[model samples]
Target: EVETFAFQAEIAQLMSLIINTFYSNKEIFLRELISNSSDALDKIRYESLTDPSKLDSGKELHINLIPNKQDRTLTIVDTGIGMTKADLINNLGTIAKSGTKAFMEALQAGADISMIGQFGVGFYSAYLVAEKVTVITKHNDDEQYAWESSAGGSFTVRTDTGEPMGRGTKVILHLKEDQTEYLEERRIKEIVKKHSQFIGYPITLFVE
Candidate 1:
């Protein structure tokens, strides 16, 4: 069953702040996402250390970047620990009340606020360049599902019957007109080298 949820008031405000206030450093969007992908890979890898069954022999432990200039989309796919439906809601739907309060307080107090790394709010940074963001993920325990939003305070999650992803997650960013720079291979390579070269997982750039 598909579900839709509105972001908490505080989360809506936080998204606005992230989009409007952090325009100068839009490249951080790529950095934050790669960092998240690395974390997910690390989680599954660590689990496999104890239980070899936790490892998927077919699926690789790597990240793939596919840029579609025709569709104006940039896709980041990682064979990592995928999220369940409930995980999607809790992690993306509403910000924790306490976390929101502390973030707002820090901002008001003129504290050096870094939303991405500090608060796990890095996902929302996609709104800096994407008109819409779509995440298709499959966990061993849950069916494949797709979550989509435009950063308009609401998001929807629905079962996806497309080809099974096997394991892990795929994030597709529908780039905004002014953000077309992200669709260029040259720019993407530069950003990946600058921010994700040292990432533990192999990052592959798919070419046509």
Candidate 2:
């Protein structure tokens, strides 16, 4: 069954602050996201060490960036450990053991001002430049599912009937009116090379 969940009360406020006040440099959004992709790849790779079958039959692990100017979309695809419905709820919906109030207080206390991923909220950084974000992921233990939100207090998750992803996650960012810089192939390539060059996986940017 499909489900829609509201962000934890603190998470809602934290998201609002992230979208409205934090992250002065929007380009860091890509850096944090790519870093997270690399981490996911590392996780699956480690798991594969114990259970060889977890490698998806030896499918090459990589990341792909597809930019669509006409549609104002930038899609980041990663062949890594995808999230299940429960994983999405716990990771994105709630703040885990760290309540939102403490998390927010830390930020206000002059903690290290890194991008979103630094504190496990990197996915929401898409809102820095996107009006909406969609994540389609397929996990080895769960059916393909899509999670969507507009940085609002709630998000929806549903079964995905589209083509199966085999294994991995795809993040599609719907660029905002003033955030068109992210839709340019050249710009994205530069950002990838600058911040994600040392990433363990190969990152391919599709340009047409």
Candidate 3:
């Protein structure tokens, strides 16, 4: 099914900045996304370590990066707590939550905003290179759902058809012509180390 949601007026400008300038190195998009996944995996692992019930559920905390050179596509998958429909909307609906306010404040205050990471908006960073994006997610508390978007246009949401793989999220990025660096092994590894080495979980890449 299709649902229409409106974003704030400034959202257009914000997206323009993100797609055009905010991120200096285009390959950093993958780093940010994967970093976010690492954080998610950390959350689940931490919670499970504290809650015996979660441990009993037998879920593993892991992040997988799959790169397909043939289709110029990159997929990041995580076996962590996933988002529900409402969570998806609240997380993906706008630009402000991406730390625009804090980032601006830091910039205005002459502080380095470079360390600031986008909150829920990290997922949208895939658009910097992707012509189209698809997200398949399964949550412990909700049914599987698929969220699709193409840059600034409307996004579609529906019940996912694929078999649910425990609890996790999978992001598929359809790369653009000028954004093939993400498919390179050494390049992606350098980025992960530069931005996400301190993440609480392990990160692995699957290349073919």
Candidate with best lDDT: 1
lDDT tens digits, residue span 1-208, model 2 = 6788887776777668767885567887888778778888888898998998998634788888888988989999999988887888785455543644555667778764353455676776778888899999988999899998886788889999987898889999999898998888888888888888898889988985
Worst 10 residues of 1 by lDDT: 91-100
lDDT of 3 by residue, 107-183 (tens): 46764323445444455566677888888887667888988776574567888878767788898898888888888
For each candidate, the alpha-carbon lDDT, in order, equals 0.81, 0.80, 0.70
How big is the positional error of residue 155 in model 2, measured in Å on the Cα after superposition?
A: 0.2
State model 2's lDDT: 0.80
- What order do you get sorting by lDDT, best first? 1, 2, 3
Q: Tell me, what's the RMSD of every candidate?
A: 2.1, 2.1, 3.1
Ranking 2 against 3 by TM-score, winner:
2
Tens-place lDDT digits, model 1, residues 137-165: 98777889999888778888999988788
Q: Sort by TM-score, best first: what order?
A: 2, 1, 3
Cα deviation in Å at residue 25, candidate 1? 1.5
